[PDB]
mmCIF file of C-alpha atoms in Angstrom:
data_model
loop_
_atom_site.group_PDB
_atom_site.id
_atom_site.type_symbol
_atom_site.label_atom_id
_atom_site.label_comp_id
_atom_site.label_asym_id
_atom_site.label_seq_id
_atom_site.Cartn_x
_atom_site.Cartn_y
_atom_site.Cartn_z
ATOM 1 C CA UNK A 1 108.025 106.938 103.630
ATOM 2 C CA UNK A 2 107.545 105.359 107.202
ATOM 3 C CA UNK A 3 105.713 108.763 108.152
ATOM 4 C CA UNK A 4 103.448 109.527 104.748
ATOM 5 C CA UNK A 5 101.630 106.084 105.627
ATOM 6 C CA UNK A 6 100.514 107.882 109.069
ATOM 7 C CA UNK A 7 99.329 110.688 107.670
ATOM 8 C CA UNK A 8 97.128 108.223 105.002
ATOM 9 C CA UNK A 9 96.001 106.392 107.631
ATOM 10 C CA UNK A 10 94.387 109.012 109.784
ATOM 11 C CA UNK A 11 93.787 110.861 107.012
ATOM 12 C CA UNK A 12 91.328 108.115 105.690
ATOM 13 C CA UNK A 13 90.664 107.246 109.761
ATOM 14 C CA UNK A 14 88.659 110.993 109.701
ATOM 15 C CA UNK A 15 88.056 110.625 105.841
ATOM 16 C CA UNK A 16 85.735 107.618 106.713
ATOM 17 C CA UNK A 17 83.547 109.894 109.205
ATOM 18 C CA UNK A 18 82.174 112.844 106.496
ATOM 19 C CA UNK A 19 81.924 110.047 103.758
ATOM 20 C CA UNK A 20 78.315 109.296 104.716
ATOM 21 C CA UNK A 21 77.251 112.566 104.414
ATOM 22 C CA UNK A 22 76.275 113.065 100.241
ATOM 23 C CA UNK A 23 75.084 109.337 100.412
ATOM 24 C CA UNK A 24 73.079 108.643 103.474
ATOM 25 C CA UNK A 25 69.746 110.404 101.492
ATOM 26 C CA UNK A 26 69.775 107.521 99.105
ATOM 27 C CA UNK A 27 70.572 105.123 102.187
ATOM 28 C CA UNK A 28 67.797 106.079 104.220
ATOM 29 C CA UNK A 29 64.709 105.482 102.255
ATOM 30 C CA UNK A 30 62.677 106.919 105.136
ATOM 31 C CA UNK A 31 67.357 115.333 110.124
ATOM 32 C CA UNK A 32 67.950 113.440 112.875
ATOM 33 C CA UNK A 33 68.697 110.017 111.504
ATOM 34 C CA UNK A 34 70.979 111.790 108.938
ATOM 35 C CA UNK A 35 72.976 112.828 112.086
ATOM 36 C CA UNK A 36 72.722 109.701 114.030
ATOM 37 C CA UNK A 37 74.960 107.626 111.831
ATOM 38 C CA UNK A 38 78.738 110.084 112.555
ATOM 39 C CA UNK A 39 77.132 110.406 115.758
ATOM 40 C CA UNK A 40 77.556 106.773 116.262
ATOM 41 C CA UNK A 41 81.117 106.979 114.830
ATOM 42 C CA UNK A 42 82.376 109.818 117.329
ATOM 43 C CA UNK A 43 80.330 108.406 120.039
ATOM 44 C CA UNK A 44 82.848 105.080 119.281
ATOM 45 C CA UNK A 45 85.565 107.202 118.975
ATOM 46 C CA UNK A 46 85.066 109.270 122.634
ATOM 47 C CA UNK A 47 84.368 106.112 124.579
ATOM 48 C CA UNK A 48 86.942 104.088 123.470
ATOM 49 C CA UNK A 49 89.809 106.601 123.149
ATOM 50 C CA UNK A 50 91.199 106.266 126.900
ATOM 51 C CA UNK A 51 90.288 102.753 126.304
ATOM 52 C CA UNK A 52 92.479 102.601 122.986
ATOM 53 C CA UNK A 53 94.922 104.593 124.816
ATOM 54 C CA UNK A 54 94.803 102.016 127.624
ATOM 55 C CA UNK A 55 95.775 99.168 124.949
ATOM 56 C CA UNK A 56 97.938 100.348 123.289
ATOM 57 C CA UNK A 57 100.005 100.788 126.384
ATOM 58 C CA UNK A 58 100.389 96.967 126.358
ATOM 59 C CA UNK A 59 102.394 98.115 117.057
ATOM 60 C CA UNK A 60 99.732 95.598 116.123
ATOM 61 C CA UNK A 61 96.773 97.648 117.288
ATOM 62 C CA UNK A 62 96.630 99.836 113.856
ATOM 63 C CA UNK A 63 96.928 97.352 111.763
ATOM 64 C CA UNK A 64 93.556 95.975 113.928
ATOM 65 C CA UNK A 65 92.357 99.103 113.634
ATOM 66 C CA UNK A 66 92.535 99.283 110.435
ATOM 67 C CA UNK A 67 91.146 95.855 109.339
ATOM 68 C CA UNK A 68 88.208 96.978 111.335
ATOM 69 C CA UNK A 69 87.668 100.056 109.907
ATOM 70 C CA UNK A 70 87.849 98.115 106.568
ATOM 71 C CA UNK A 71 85.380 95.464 106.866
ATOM 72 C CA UNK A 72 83.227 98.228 108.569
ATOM 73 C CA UNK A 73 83.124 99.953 105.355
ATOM 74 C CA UNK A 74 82.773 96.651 103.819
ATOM 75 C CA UNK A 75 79.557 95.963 105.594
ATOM 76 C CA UNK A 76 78.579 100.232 105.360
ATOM 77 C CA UNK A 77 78.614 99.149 101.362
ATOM 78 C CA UNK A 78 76.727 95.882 101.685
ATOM 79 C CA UNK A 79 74.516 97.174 104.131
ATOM 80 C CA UNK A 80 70.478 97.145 103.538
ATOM 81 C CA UNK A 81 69.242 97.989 107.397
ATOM 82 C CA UNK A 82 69.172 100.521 109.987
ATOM 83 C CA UNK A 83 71.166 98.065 112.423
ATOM 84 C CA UNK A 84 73.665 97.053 110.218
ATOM 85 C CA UNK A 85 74.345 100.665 109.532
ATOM 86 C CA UNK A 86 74.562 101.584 113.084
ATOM 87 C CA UNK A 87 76.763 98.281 113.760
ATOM 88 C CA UNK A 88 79.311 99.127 110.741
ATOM 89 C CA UNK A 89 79.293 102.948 112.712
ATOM 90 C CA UNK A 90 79.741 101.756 115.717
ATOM 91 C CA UNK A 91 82.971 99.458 114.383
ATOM 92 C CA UNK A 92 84.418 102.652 112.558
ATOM 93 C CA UNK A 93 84.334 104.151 115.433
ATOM 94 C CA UNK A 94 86.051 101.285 117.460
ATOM 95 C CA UNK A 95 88.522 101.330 114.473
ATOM 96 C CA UNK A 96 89.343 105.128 114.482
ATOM 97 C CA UNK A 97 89.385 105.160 118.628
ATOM 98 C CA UNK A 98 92.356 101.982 118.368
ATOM 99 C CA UNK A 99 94.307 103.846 115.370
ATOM 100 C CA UNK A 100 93.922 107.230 116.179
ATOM 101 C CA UNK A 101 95.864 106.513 119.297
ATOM 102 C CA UNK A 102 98.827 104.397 117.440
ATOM 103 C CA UNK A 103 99.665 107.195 114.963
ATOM 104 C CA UNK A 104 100.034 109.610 118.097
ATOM 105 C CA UNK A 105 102.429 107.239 119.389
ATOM 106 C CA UNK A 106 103.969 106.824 116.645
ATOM 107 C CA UNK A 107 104.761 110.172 115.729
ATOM 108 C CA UNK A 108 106.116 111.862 118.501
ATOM 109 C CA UNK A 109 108.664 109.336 118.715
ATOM 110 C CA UNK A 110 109.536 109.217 114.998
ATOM 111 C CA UNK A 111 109.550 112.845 114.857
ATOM 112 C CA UNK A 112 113.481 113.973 115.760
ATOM 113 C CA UNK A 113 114.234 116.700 118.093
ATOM 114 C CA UNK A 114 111.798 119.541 117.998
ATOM 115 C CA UNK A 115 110.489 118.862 114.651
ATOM 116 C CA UNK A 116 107.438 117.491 116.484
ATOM 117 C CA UNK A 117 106.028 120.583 117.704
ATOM 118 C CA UNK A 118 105.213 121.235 113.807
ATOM 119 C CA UNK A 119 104.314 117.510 112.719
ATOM 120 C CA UNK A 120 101.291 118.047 115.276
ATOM 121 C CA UNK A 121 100.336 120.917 113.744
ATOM 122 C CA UNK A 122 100.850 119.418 110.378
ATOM 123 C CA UNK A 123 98.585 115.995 112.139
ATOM 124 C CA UNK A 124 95.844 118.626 112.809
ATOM 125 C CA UNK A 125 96.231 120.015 109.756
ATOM 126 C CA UNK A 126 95.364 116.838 107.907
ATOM 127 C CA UNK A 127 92.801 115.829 110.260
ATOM 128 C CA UNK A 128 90.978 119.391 109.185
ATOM 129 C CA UNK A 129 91.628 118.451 105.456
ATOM 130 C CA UNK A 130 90.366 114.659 105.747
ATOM 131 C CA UNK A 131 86.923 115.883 107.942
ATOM 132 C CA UNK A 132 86.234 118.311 105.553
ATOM 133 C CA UNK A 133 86.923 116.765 102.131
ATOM 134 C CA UNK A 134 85.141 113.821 103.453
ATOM 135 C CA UNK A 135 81.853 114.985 101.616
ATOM 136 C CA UNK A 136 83.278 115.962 98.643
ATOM 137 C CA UNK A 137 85.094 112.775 98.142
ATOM 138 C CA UNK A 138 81.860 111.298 98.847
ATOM 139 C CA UNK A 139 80.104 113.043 96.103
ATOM 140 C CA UNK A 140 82.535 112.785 93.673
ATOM 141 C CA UNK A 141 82.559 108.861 94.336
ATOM 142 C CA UNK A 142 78.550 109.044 94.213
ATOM 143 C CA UNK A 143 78.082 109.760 90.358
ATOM 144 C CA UNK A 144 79.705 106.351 89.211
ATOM 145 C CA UNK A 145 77.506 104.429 92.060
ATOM 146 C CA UNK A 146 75.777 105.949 95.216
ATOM 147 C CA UNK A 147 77.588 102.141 96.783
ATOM 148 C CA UNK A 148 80.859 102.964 95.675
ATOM 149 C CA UNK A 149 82.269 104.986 97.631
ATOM 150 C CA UNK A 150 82.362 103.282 100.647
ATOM 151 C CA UNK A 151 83.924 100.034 98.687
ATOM 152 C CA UNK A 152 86.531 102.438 97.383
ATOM 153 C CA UNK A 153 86.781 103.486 101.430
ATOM 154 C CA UNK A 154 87.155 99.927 102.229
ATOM 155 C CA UNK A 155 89.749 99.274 99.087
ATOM 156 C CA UNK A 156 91.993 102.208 100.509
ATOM 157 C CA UNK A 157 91.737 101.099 103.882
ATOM 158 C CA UNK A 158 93.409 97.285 102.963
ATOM 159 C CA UNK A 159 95.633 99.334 100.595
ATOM 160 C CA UNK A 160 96.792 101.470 104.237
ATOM 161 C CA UNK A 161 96.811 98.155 106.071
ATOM 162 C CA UNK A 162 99.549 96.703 103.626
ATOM 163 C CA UNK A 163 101.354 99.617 103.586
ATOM 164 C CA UNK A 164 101.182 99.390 107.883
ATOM 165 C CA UNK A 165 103.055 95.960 107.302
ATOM 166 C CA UNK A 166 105.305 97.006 104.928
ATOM 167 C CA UNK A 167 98.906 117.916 137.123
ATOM 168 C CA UNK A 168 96.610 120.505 137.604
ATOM 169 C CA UNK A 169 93.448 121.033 134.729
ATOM 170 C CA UNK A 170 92.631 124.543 135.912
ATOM 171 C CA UNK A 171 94.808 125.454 132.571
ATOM 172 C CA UNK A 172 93.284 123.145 130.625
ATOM 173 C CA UNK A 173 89.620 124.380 131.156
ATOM 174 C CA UNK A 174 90.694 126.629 128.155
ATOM 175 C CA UNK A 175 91.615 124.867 124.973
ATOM 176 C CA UNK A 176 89.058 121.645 126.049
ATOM 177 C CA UNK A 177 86.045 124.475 125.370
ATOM 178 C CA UNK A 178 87.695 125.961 122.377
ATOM 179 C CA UNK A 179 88.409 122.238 121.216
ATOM 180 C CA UNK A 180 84.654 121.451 122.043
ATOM 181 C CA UNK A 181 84.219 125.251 119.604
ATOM 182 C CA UNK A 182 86.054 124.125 117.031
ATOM 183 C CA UNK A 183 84.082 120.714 116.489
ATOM 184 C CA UNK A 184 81.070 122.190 117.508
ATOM 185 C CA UNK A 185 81.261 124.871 115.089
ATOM 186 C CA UNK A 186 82.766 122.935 112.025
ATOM 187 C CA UNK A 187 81.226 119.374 112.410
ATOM 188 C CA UNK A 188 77.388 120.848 112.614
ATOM 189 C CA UNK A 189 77.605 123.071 109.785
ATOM 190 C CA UNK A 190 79.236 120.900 107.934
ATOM 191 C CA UNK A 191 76.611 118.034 108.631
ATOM 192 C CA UNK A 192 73.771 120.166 107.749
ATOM 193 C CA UNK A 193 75.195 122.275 104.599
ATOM 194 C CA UNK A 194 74.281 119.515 102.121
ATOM 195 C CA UNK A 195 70.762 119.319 103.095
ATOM 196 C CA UNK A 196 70.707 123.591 103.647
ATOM 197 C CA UNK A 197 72.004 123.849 100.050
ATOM 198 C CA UNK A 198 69.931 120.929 98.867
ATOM 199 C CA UNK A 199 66.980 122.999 99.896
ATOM 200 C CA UNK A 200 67.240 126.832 99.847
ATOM 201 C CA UNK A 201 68.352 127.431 96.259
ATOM 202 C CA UNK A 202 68.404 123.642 95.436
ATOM 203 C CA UNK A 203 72.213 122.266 94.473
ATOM 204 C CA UNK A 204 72.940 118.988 92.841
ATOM 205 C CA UNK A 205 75.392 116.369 94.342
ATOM 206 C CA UNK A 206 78.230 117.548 92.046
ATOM 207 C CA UNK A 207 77.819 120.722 92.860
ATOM 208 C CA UNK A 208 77.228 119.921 96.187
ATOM 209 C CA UNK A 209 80.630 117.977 96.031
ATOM 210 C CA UNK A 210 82.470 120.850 94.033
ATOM 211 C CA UNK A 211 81.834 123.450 96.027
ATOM 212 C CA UNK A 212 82.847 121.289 99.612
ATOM 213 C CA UNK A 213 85.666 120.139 97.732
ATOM 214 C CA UNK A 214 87.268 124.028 96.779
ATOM 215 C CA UNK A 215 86.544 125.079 99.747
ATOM 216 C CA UNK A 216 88.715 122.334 101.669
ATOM 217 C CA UNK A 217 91.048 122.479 99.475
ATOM 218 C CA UNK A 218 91.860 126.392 99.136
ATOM 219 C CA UNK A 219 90.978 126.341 103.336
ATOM 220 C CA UNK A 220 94.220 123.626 103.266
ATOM 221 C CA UNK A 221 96.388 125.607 100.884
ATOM 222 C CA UNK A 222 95.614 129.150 103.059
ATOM 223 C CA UNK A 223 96.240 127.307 106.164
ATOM 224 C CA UNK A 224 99.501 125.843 105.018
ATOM 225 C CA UNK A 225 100.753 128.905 103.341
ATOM 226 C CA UNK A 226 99.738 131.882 105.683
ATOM 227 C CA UNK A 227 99.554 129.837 108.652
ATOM 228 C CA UNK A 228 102.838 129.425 108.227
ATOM 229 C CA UNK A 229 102.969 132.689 107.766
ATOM 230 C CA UNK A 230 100.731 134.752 109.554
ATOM 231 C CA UNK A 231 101.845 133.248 113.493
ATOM 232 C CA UNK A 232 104.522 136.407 113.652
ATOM 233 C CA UNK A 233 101.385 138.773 112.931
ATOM 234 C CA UNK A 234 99.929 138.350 115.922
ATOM 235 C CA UNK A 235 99.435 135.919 119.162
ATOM 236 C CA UNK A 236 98.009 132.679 119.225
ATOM 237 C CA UNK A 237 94.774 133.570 121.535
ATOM 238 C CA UNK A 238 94.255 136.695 119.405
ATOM 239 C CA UNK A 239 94.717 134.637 116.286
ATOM 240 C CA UNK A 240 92.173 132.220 116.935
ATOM 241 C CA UNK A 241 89.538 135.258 118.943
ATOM 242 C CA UNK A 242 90.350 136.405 115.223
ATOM 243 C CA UNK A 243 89.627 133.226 112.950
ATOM 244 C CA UNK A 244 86.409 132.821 115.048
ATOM 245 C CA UNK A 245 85.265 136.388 113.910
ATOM 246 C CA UNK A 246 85.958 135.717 110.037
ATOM 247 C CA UNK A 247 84.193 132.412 110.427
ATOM 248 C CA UNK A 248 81.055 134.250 111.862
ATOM 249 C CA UNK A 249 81.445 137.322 109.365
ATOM 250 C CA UNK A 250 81.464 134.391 106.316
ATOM 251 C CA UNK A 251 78.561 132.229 108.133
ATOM 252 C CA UNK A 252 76.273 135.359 108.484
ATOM 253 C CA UNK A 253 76.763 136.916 105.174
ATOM 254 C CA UNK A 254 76.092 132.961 103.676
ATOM 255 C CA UNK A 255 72.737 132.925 105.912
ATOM 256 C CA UNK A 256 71.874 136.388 103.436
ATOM 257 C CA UNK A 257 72.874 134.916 99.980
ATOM 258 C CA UNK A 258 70.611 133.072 97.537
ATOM 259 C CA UNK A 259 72.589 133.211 94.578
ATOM 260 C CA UNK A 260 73.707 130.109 93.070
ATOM 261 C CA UNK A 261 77.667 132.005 92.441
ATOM 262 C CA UNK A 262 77.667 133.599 95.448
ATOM 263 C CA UNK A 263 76.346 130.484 97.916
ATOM 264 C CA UNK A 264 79.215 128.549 95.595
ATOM 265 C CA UNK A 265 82.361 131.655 95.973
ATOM 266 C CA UNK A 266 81.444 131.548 99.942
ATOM 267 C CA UNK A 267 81.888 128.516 100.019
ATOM 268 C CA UNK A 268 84.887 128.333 98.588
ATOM 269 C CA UNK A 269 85.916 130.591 101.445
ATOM 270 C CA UNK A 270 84.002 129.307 104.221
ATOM 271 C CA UNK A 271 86.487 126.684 105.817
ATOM 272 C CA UNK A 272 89.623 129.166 105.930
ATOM 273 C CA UNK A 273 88.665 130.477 110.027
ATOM 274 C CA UNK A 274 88.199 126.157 111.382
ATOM 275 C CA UNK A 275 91.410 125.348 108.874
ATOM 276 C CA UNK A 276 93.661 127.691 110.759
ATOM 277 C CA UNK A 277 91.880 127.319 113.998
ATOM 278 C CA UNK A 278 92.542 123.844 114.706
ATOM 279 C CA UNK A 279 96.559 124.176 114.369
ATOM 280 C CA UNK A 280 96.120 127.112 116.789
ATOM 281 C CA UNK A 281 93.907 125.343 119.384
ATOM 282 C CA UNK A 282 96.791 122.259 118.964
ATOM 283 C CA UNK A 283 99.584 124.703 119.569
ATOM 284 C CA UNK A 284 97.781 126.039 122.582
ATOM 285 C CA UNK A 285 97.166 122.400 123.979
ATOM 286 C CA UNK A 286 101.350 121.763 123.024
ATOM 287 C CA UNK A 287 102.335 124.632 125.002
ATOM 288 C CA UNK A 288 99.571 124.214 127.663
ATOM 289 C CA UNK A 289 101.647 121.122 128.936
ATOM 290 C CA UNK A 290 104.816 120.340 127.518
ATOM 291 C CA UNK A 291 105.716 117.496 129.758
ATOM 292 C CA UNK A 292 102.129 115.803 129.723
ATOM 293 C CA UNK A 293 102.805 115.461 125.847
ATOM 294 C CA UNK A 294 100.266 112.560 124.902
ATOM 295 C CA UNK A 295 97.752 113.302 128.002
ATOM 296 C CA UNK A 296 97.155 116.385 126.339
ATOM 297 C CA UNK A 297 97.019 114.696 123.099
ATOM 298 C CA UNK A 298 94.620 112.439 124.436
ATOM 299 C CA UNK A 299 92.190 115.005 125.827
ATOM 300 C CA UNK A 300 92.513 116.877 122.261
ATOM 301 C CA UNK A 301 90.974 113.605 121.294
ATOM 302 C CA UNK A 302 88.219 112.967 123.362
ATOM 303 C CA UNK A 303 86.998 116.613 123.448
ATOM 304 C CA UNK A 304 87.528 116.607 119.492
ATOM 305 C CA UNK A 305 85.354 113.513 119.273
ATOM 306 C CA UNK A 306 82.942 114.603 121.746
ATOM 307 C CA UNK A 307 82.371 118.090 119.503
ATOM 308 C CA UNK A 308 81.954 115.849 116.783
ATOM 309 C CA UNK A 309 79.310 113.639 118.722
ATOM 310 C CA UNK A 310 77.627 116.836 119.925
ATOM 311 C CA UNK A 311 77.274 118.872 116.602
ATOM 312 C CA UNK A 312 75.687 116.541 114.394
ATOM 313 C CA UNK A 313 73.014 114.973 116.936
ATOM 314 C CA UNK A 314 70.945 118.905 117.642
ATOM 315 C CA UNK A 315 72.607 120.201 114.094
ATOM 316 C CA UNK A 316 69.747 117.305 112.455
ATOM 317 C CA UNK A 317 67.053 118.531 114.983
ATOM 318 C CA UNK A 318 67.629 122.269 114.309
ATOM 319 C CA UNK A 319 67.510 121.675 110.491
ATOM 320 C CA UNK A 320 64.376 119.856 111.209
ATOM 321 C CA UNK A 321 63.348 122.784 112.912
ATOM 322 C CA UNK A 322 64.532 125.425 110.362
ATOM 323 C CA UNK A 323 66.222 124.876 107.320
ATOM 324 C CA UNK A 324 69.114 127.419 108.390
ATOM 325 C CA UNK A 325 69.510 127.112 112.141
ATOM 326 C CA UNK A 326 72.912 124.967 112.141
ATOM 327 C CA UNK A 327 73.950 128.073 110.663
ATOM 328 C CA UNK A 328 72.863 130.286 113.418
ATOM 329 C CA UNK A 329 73.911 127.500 115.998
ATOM 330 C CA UNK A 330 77.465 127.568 114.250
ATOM 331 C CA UNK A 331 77.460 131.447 114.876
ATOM 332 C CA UNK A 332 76.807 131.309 118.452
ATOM 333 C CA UNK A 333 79.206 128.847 119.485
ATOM 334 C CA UNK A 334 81.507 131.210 117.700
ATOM 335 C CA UNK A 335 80.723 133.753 119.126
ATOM 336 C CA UNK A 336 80.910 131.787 122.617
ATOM 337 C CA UNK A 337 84.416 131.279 121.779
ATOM 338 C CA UNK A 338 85.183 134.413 121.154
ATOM 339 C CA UNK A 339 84.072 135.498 124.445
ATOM 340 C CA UNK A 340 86.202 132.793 125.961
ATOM 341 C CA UNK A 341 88.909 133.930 124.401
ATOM 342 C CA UNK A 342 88.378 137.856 125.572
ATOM 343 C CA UNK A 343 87.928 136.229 129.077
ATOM 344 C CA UNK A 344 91.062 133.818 129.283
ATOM 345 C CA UNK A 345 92.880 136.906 127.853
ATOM 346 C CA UNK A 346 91.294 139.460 130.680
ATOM 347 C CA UNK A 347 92.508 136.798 133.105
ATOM 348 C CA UNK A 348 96.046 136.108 131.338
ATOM 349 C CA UNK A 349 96.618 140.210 131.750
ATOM 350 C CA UNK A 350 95.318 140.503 135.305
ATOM 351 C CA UNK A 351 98.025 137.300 136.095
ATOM 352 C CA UNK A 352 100.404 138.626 134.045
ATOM 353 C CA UNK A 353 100.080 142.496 136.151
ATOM 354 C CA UNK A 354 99.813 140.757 139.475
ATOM 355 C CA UNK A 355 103.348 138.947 139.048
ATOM 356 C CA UNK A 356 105.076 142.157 137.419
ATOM 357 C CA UNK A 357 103.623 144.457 140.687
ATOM 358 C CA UNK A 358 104.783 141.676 142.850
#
């Protein structure tokens, strides 16, 4: 019970930074503005993550955290101006940065022996899920109201404060990139797909919404199911060089299809290589440095929140250049990974060789 309210709470924590996303064309009234807004939010989130971390080292700073994120929604719902909006962001992100780092806390202590390893995985996990549904959520909420959803935001988020009451970095160099992949890769495309399938074969909110919605939620189910089961299959450097190749084989075969079935069955299937990624890249970061458990949870954070500060912010500019170039952005810093991969593995071999001739 104690541990389900966590994983609510950060699920609506990363819920609350895709929600904008279906809704902010009705907000804006008159690319990069549309990207501005959850740049705000992870801009929030980067600065004040040491910051958060540094407080709650002195617990009552979620339930803060989440009062703020609540009456930032509040204010996101009765909000008329470009200030206001960028305030409310700016508190979100404030509000995520001062829970985020609570629920870490929390859960490798409430976590028993090494059942921990697996509830991170299972944290990144839902972070994946709550980023990625965000949107759909969003658009589903839009039909009754384009206002509601971020009152229903704000109504779950005093819901989840009631249930609150009741070294060396040469290693490290690795996962931070891949981290700063991950985000880069999802974050963008997922900030521009809307407006990309809102204007090559012209969808409609709810099937804007639908299709965002399948795919997280089949993404989820294949991560859970053959994540669990696909780790003995091969390594976890080789399994994430691998999830980064399916992603680009899926984004480059969406850049050539027009049809309205085929954009929406791609879809469907789009978020399965960043779903099973982002365990990987958390299991890397857990075995990276087992005794600086929290350190490297805190640099998964900032490097996280940085992607998603980064992606967004040229991801509006290239759309306003062309219509598909998140797409081909998303590809490259793919492929980028990839190549990071191939080289940490190159040097992981030539280590490896050195110690066995020694």
């Amino acid at each position: 019970k104690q541990i389900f309210v966590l994983y609510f709470n950060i699920f609506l924590i990363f819920l609350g930074i895709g929600l904008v996303i279906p809704v902010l064309p009705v907000y804006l009234k008159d690319g990069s503005d549309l990207g501005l807004l959850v740049a705000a939010f992870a801009l929030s989130q980067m600065i004040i993550s040491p910051f958060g971390g540094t407080l709650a080292d002195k617990k009552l700073i979620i339930c803060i955290g989440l009062i703020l994120f609540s009456v930032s929604e509040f204010m996101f719902a009765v909000g008329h101006n470009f200030s206001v909006l960028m305030l409310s962001r700016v508190i979100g992100g404030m509000s995520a940065g001062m829970v985020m780092p609570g629920v870490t806390g929390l859960i490798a202590d409430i976590s028993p022996s090494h059942q921990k390893a697996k509830n991170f995985g299972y944290m990144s996990a839902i972070i994946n899920s709550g980023f990625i549904l965000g949107p759909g959520i969003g658009g589903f909420m839009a039909e009754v109201s384009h206002r509601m959803p971020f009152y229903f935001a704000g109504a779950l988020g005093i819901l989840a404060f009631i249930m609150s009451i009741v070294i060396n970095w040469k290693v490290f160099i690795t996962p931070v990139i891949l981290t700063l992949v991950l985000s880069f890769g999802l974050s963008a495309f997922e900030t521009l797909y809307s407006l990309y399938t809102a204007d090559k074969v012209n969808y409609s909110p709810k099937d804007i919404s639908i299709a965002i919605t399948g795919g997280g939620i089949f993404g989820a189910l294949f991560q859970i199911y053959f994540f669990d089961k696909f780790m003995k299959y091969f390594s976890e450097l080789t399994f994430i060089a691998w999830s980064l190749l399916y992603s680009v084989v899926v984004l480059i075969l969406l850049v050539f299809a027009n049809d309205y079935w085929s954009i929406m069955l791609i879809s469907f299937v789009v978020f399965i290589g960043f779903d099973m990624i982002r365990p990987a890249i958390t299991n890397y970061f857990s075995n990276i440095a087992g005794e600086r458990q929290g350190f490297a949870g805190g640099l998964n954070s900032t490097f996280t929140s940085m992607g998603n500060f980064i992606g967004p912010l040229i991801a509006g500019a290239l759309f306003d250049v062309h219509i598909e170039a998140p797409i081909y952005m998303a590809i490259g810093v793919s492929l980028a990974g990839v190549v990071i991969v191939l080289i940490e593995k190159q040097h992981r071999a030539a280590a490896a060789d050195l110690e066995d001739n020694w």
